[PDB]
Amino acid sequence: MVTAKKDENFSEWYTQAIVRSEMIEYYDISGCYIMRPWAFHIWEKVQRFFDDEIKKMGVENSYFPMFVSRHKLESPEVAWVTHYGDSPLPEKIAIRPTSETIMYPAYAKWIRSHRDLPLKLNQWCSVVRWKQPTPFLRTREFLWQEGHTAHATEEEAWELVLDILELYRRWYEECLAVPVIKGEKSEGEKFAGGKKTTTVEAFIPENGRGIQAATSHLLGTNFAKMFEIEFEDEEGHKRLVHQTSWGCTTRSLGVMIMTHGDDKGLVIPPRVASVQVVIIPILFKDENTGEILGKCRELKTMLEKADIRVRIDDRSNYTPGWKYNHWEVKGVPLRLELGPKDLAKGTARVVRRDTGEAYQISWADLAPKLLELMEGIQRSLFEKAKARLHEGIEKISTFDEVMPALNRKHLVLAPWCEDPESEEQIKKETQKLSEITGAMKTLCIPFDQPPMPEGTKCFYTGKPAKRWTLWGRSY
Amino acid sequence: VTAKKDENFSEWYTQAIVRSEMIEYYDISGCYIMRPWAFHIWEKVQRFFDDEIKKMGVENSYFPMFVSRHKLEEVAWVTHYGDSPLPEKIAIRPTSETIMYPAYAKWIRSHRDLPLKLNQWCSVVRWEFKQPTPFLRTREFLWQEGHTAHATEEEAWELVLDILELYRRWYEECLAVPVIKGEKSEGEKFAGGKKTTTVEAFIPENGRGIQAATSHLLGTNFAKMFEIEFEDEEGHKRLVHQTSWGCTTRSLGVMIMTHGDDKGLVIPPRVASVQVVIIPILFKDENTGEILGKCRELKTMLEKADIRVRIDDRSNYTPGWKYNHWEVKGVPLRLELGPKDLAKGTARVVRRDTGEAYQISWADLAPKLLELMEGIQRSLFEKAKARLHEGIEKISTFDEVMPALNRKHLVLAPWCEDPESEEQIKKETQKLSEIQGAMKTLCIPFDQPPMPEGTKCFYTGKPAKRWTLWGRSY
Ligand code: PRO
Ligand code: PRO
Ligand SMILES: [Cl-]
Ligand SMILES: [Cl-]
Ligand SMILES: [Cl-]
């Protein structure tokens, strides 16, 4: 059971929710965590969804080495292997922080003709980047997928950037039921070396902080010229390829926990629940023990015929109430209870994890009714989170409105001139003002742009505003 | 491929893997990029094995790749991040055991907590490889590693054998590679384990056995080291009985070696990223769409029967070049479509393993190909199975060893299972080859021939316990 309240000590609540649901075991090396099966199931669900979808686009999986040489890599985040035993290595080598400099010389070799394009590769793997750490959200080693494509034209690459971003929106919004906002990163927050970076952003109300949930980069021709990735044209001329890079990590899991967890623990959206329905037989004295177990197995068969993922917790060595607490901590969306009274009526009692509402459902009606309940729960998790997001964003016009909004734990949407030095000035000014990390930075320039009335000044510099921009305190 | 597989096998292997586009080289020695043509085979066997161990209640997990100095008291030391030194150096994991088993000691308290069954899909780094080659001797490789804890030895041993059977199916049903189940000798088992089981394969071209996968009955020794104890139903503290089991991308190497021929790779249809390559008979600048349009219609029809299909419509290569290209990659089936094929409603299909050709009506295309594919798969297995049984000589005395070794064979010999005799045999077989390469045990096969009363060990003279399989090996 969880005892910390989510709206009181949020970080203690998070620690308790992920430990007591058996998702995480803490580790002696700061920022590394053991990922226990209950978490890994969710990761497998979202991985299967994303892997199928990118296969439909013609992306093929591959595996590149986890080590990278000093020359190919050339910064402060990179872990260096420098010794073997007590002897120093002749040349130190790095553990991959990301694989651009690992794959792209191979791309340079593999690409000769426009007939070789597009090249579309993806890798499921872990990476290492070395603030204070948080399980799932900021860890030193994390699991991810990284996709890397090369195209003959820029327009084709950008289309792929946007298709991938849409997939990431589905990953968060259709699987995890986490609303996100699509936008571009500012020039100082984008991938180093790339042309343009797009992103989905999520919000965490309890601390009012924005978090980058996934990114899709138009690399353009910048890496192509640094790695000499050229192809021959139909015309016969040599051209640089146009590249994209895109990645998504186990941060998504943390975002889901924070988004849907409550004072009793996890709430797992049915689309990623390894167990959607847990069937709990109520055995007390020997009150029709075998008939109960048999009817439970029947119900499991019947529900699996509608592709519902069902476990029967018929373990002897635990009490039913213990089983209720266990699967509630764990976040299983639906609990089905069956006792001698329930066998007598031809019904079963069903409790939704998200709200606690109980239903008596006859056996014949179980499958369609539970499908309806699961779709209701998924949709309701999403809509409540989306409402919290809508009320977490203040639209403002001048700098004076910023500190009040931030202190309500809100994001700000403000007209901005998009000058890069102004972002640094704003970060430092908001840090200083919050003293009396507290800094506000750009989360993204949203795709969905309100109208910009003629003569709207930048909310900070007074120069003409270019676009509406989403700022907040960040992860 | 110019090297001949029976005549210069090392060379044949290197040429065949590179010309097949399965791997790419890298600027850090011993590391190889797995390109999709090979990674897809990994993905298929991974999915099969993972489905089957999930049917057993094994669940996947992830453990960090670093180990502290504190917890370790020939490791790779990470000592800096950026230009900044770490306060204390950390290390890259030597074992996963050293990270998982303290966690196991924490998680297991009561008989209620058993059995615990975990698996990890990950990569592994080994820093001392002698001279590298793809899939066999590499600085980094992929694998799965399963670790379980049970309340009794019988349950753990049951799982050891169930996993071994899954491994047999991995090799034999996916990769069409025949393997032999057995238990390792005392001198070749996992160090602190009770019993190690193995599937073994055989490479006829150099006559070497190669270990395909291992499933260990660890017993209670690791439980004693790490204090993985549980309280049983009567209140007593007992030690858990552990198992571990693993299998690696070396499996891909063994498939190459088994099925490849002088033209190059032959990939079993069950795991081939492309099962059917469609080759339009065209030449540059001629494309009117008639031939490519029919090729696309055929692709759609074959994909409806869940056949994995690729069309090679590249303009700059002649059809002969493409035939050679896809044969060197080892696509099981090629479908040639040209002007007469079009003008008569047929297609010409060629099997990669035998070179036999079929003129097939478009209507019959999808059924027939399914048939062809299953045939190819079965044929690949049974031919290899025959080679395996022709490579094993059943002997009785040491006198027969050196001849059999020189026929590039394995020997099945009655043995007293004394470990020192195993190391003596390694030394002598080795000295004899030098004067003309050592011969070790591969396994004691589960399938034991009858042992006539009073048979003596082929080397020591003492009473024989069991028939043991010996050979040179990888
Ligand atoms: O690390 C990143 O952000 C990009 C996207 C995935 C690969 N590299
Ligand atoms: O190295 C081995 O053979 C065993 C397999 C699982 C982990 N360790
Ligand atoms: Cl653009
Ligand atoms: Cl069950
Ligand atoms: Cl020799």
The secondary structure of chain B, three-state, reads: CCCCCCCCHHHHHHHHHHHCCCEECCCCCCCCEECHHHHHHHHHHHHHHHHHHHCCCCEECECCCEEEHHHHCCCEEEEEECCEEEEEEEEECCCCHHHHHHHHHHHCCEHHHCCEEEEEEEEEECCCCCCCECCCECCEEEEEEEEEEECCHHHHHHHHHHHHHHHHHHHHHHCCCCCEEEECCHHHCCCCCCEEEEEEEEECCCCEEEEEEEEEEEECHHHHHHCCEEECCCCCEEECEEEEEEEECHHHHHHHHHHCECCECCCCCCCCCCCEEEEECCCCCCCCCHHHHHHHHHHHHHHHCCCCEEECCCCCCCHHHHHHHHHHHCCCEEEEECHHHHHHCEEEEEECCCCCEEEEECCCHHHHHHHHHHHHHHHHHHHHHHHHHHCEEECCCHHHHHHHHHCCCEEEEEECCCHHHHHHHHHHHHHHHHHCCCCEEEEEECCCCCCCCCCECCCCCCECCEEEEEECEC
- Rounded Cα–Cα distance for residues A118 and A107 (Å): 11
- Rounded Cα–Cα distance for residues A183 and B222 (Å): 52
- Which chain A residues are within 8 Å of B79, Cβ to Cβ? 80, 82-83
Question: Hey, is A21 helix, strand or coil?
Answer: coil
> Is the separation of the CB atoms in B309 and B402 below 8 Å?
no
Residue among B199, B181, B175, B200 nearest B381 (CA): B175
- Rounded Cα–Cα distance for residues A156 and A242 (Å): 8
- Rounded Cα–Cα distance for residues B168 and B381 (Å): 13
Residue whose tokens read 């849409």? A166
The dihedral through the CA atoms of A419, A421, A426, A429 has a sign that is negative
What is the end-to-end Cα distance of chain B in Å, rounded? 24
**Contact check, Cβ <8 Å, A25/B118:** no
Q: Residue B123 falls within a domain, yes or no?
A: yes
Query: How many beta-carbon pairs under 8 angstroms link A with B?
Result: 140
Closest approach of chain A CAs to the CA of B113, in angstroms? 10
φ, ψ for residue B186 (rounded to 5)? -60, -40
- Rounded Cα–Cα distance for residues B125 and A169 (Å): 35
> Is the separation of the CB atoms in B215 and B200 below 8 Å?
no
Q: How far from B410 is each of A297, B13, B388, B396, B401, CA to CA, in Å? A: 51, 22, 9, 13, 9
> Is the separation of the CB atoms in A411 and A208 below 8 Å?
yes
The dihedral through the CA atoms of A59, A63, A68, A71 has a sign that is negative
Indicate the residue among B374, B405, B437 that finishes a domain: B374
Rounded (10°) CA dihedral B386, B388, B391, B397: -120
> Is the separation of the CB atoms in B291 and B282 below 8 Å?
yes
φ, ψ for residue B259 (rounded to 5)? -105, -15
> In the PDB record, what is the listed experimental method?
X-ray
The dihedral through the CA atoms of B155, B157, B160, B165 has a sign that is negative
φ, ψ for residue A427 (rounded to 5)? -55, -50
**Contact check, Cβ <8 Å, A44/B36:** no
Pair (A301, A363) in one structural domain: yes
> Is the separation of the CB atoms in B266 and B260 below 8 Å?
yes
- Rounded Cα–Cα distance for residues A276 and B44 (Å): 27
Q: Is the CB of A199 under 6 A from ligand 1?
A: no
B99-121 CB burial, b ≥16 within 10 A, e <16: bbbbbbbebbeeeebbbbbbbbb
Pair (A232, A117) in one structural domain: yes
Domain count, chain B: 3
Candidate from B145, B199, B217, B222 with most ligand 2 atoms within 8 A of CB, to mutate: B145
Which atom of ligand 1 sits closest to the CA of residue A191?
Answer: 3
Which atom of ligand 1 sits closest to the CA of residue A247?
Answer: 6
At A353, list the tokens.
């994890």
Pair (B213, B290) in one structural domain: no
Ligand nearest to C-alpha A193 = 1
Pair (A324, A226) in one structural domain: no
- Rounded Cα–Cα distance for residues A469 and A461 (Å): 14
For residue A163, say whether it is annotated as part of any ligand binding site.
yes
B61 closest CB neighbour out of A36, A78, A317: A36
Q: Residue A386 falls within a domain, yes or no?
A: no
Q: Which residues contact B417 (CB under 8 A, 6 or more apart)?
A: B185, B186, B444, B465, B466, B468
Residue among A340, A323, A214 nearest A284 (CA): A340
Which atom of ligand 2 sits closest to the CA of residue B146?
Answer: 6
Pair (A79, A161) in one structural domain: yes
Which atom of ligand 2 sits closest to the CA of residue B246?
Answer: 5
Cα A397 to chain centroid, rounded: 31
In one-letter notation, the amino acid at residue B158 is E
Question: Hey, is A123 helix, strand or coil?
Answer: strand
In one-letter notation, the amino acid at residue A192 is A
> Is the separation of the CB atoms in A339 and A307 below 8 Å?
no
**In DSSP terms, which residues pair with A211 in a beta bridge?**
A202
- Which chain A residues are within 8 Å of B90, Cβ to Cβ? 29
**In DSSP terms, which residues pair with B117 in a beta bridge?**
B148
Closest approach of chain B CAs to the CA of A89, in angstroms? 9
Nearest CA to ligand 2 atom 2: B246
Residue among A58, A293, A290 nearest A164 (CA): A58
Other beta carbons within 10 Å of A207:
12
Q: Starting from the edge strand earliest in sequence, which strands make up the sheet with B410-415, in order?
A: B59-60, B116-125, B140-150, B241-248, B208-219, B195-203, B180-183, B440-445, B466-471, B410-415, B392-394
Closest approach of chain B CAs to the CA of A79, in angstroms? 5
- HSE-CB for A222 with a 13 A CA cutoff: 14
> Is the separation of the CB atoms in A350 and A343 below 8 Å?
no
At B298, list the tokens.
């055929």
Question: How buried is B370 (Cβ within 10 angstroms: 0-12 exposed, 13-18 middle, 19+ buried)?
Answer: middle
Q: How far from A320 is each of A345, B37, B130, B302, CA to CA, in Å? A: 20, 51, 58, 52
Q: Per DSSP, which regions of A319-380 are E strands? A: 334-338, 347-352, 358-362
At A144, list the tokens.
């991810």
Pair (B324, B261) in one structural domain: no
Q: Residue A382 falls within a domain, yes or no?
A: no
**Contact check, Cβ <8 Å, A41/B35:** no
**Contact check, Cβ <8 Å, B82/A77:** yes
- Rounded Cα–Cα distance for residues A84 and B362 (Å): 61
How do beta strands B59-60 and B116-125 pair? parallel
- Rounded Cα–Cα distance for residues B421 and B223 (Å): 31
- Rounded Cα–Cα distance for residues A14 and A24 (Å): 11
At B308, list the tokens.
């994995």
Rounded (10°) CA dihedral B163, B169, B174, B180: 110
Residue among A133, A127, A143, A310 nearest B60 (CA): A143
Say how many Å lie between the CA of residue A45 and the centre of ligand 2.
27
Question: How buried is B123 (Cβ within 10 angstroms: 0-12 exposed, 13-18 middle, 19+ buried)?
Answer: middle
Residue among B31, B248, B125 nearest A103 (CA): B31
- Rounded Cα–Cα distance for residues A1 and A21 (Å): 8
Residue among A144, A125, A104, A153 nearest A62 (CA): A125
Q: How far from B14 is each of A19, A67, A213, B2, B24, CA to CA, in Å? A: 49, 23, 43, 11, 12
Q: Residue B107 falls within a domain, yes or no?
A: yes
Ligand nearest to C-alpha A194 = 1
| Residue B291 belongs to domain spanning | 269-374
φ, ψ for residue A160 (rounded to 5)? -70, -40
Q: Which residues contact B420 (CB under 8 A, 6 or more apart)?
A: none
Gyration radius (Cα) of chain B, Å: 26
- Rounded Cα–Cα distance for residues A47 and A144 (Å): 9
> Across chain B, which distance is largest between two alpha carbons, in Å?
84
Closest approach of chain B CAs to the CA of A451, in angstroms? 44
**Which of A38, A43, A52, A80 has the most B C-beta neighbours within 10 Å, making it the best mutation to test the interface with B?**
A80
- Which chain A residues are within 8 Å of B89, Cβ to Cβ? 83
Q: How far from B454 is each of B404, B445, B462, B474, CA to CA, in Å? A: 24, 20, 9, 33
Say how many Å lie between the CA of residue B215 and the centre of ligand 1.
38
> Is the separation of the CB atoms in A87 and A27 below 8 Å?
no
**Contact check, Cβ <8 Å, A27/B316:** no
Candidate from B216, B222, B243, B248 with most ligand 2 atoms within 8 A of CB, to mutate: B216
Q: Residue B381 falls within a domain, yes or no?
A: no
- Rounded Cα–Cα distance for residues A21 and B93 (Å): 27
Question: Hey, is A211 helix, strand or coil?
Answer: strand
Say how many Å lie between the CA of residue A185 and the centre of ligand 1.
14
- How many H-runs (helices) and E-runs (strands) does chain A carry? 13, 23
Question: Hey, is A147 helix, strand or coil?
Answer: strand
At B295, list the tokens.
């090729």
- Which chain A residues are within 8 Å of B31, Cβ to Cβ? 65, 67
Pair (B5, B139) in one structural domain: yes
- Rounded Cα–Cα distance for residues A241 and B471 (Å): 52
Cα A340 to chain centroid, rounded: 43
Closest approach of chain A CAs to the CA of B76, in angstroms? 5
Gyration radius (Cα) of chain A, Å: 26
Candidate from B122, B160, B245 with most ligand 2 atoms within 8 A of CB, to mutate: B245
Residue among B432, B430, B436 nearest B472 (CA): B430
Rounded (10°) CA dihedral A397, A402, A407, A408: 10
Question: Hey, is A44 helix, strand or coil?
Answer: helix
Q: Which residues contact B232 (CB under 8 A, 6 or more apart)?
A: B111, B151, B238
Q: How far from A167 is each of A163, B137, B391, CA to CA, in Å? A: 6, 38, 53
Nearest CA to ligand 1 atom 1: A98
Indicate the residue among A206, A238, A269 that finishes a domain: A269
DSSP A305: T
**In DSSP terms, which residues pair with B68 in a beta bridge?**
B90
Say how many Å lie between the CA of residue A59 and the centre of ligand 3.
22
Q: Which residues contact B48 (CB under 8 A, 6 or more apart)?
A: B169, B170, B174
Q: Residue B382 falls within a domain, yes or no?
A: no
How do beta strands B116-125 and B309-311 pair? unpaired
- Which chain A residues are within 8 Å of B107, Cβ to Cβ? 25
In one-letter notation, the amino acid at residue A147 is G
Indicate the residue among A254, A269, A284 that finishes a domain: A269
Chain breaks in chain B (C to N over 2.5 A) after: 73, 436
> Is the separation of the CB atoms in B241 and B150 below 8 Å?
yes
- HSE-CB for A153 with a 13 A CA cutoff: 4
- Rounded Cα–Cα distance for residues A388 and A475 (Å): 18
Residue whose tokens read 């919050």? A434
> Is the separation of the CB atoms in B407 and B457 below 8 Å?
no
Pair (B85, B208) in one structural domain: yes
Pair (B361, B468) in one structural domain: no
**In DSSP terms, which residues pair with A117 in a beta bridge?**
none
Pocket of ligand 2 (CB under 6 A): B 145, 214, 244-246
- Rounded Cα–Cα distance for residues B228 and B104 (Å): 6
Instruction: State the alpha helices, DSSP H only, in A21-96.
Output: 37-56, 70-73
Ligand nearest to C-alpha B57 = 4
Q: Is the peptide bond before A270 cis (omega within 30 degrees of 0)?
A: no
Other beta carbons within 10 Å of B72:
12
φ, ψ for residue A63 (rounded to 5)? -145, 120
Pair (A242, A296) in one structural domain: no
DSSP A300: H
A79 closest CB neighbour out of B39, B78, B83: B78
Q: Residue A388 falls within a domain, yes or no?
A: no
> Is the separation of the CB atoms in B191 and B185 below 8 Å?
no
Closest approach of chain A CAs to the CA of B195, in angstroms? 28
Pair (B251, B276) in one structural domain: no
- Which chain A residues are within 8 Å of B26, Cβ to Cβ? 65
Other beta carbons within 10 Å of B344:
10
Question: How buried is B338 (Cβ within 10 angstroms: 0-12 exposed, 13-18 middle, 19+ buried)?
Answer: middle
What is the end-to-end Cα distance of chain A in Å, rounded? 28
Q: Residue A384 falls within a domain, yes or no?
A: no
- Which chain A residues are within 8 Å of B63, Cβ to Cβ? 34-35
Pair (B222, B247) in one structural domain: yes
B65 closest CB neighbour out of A80, A83, A126: A126
- Rounded Cα–Cα distance for residues B192 and B218 (Å): 7
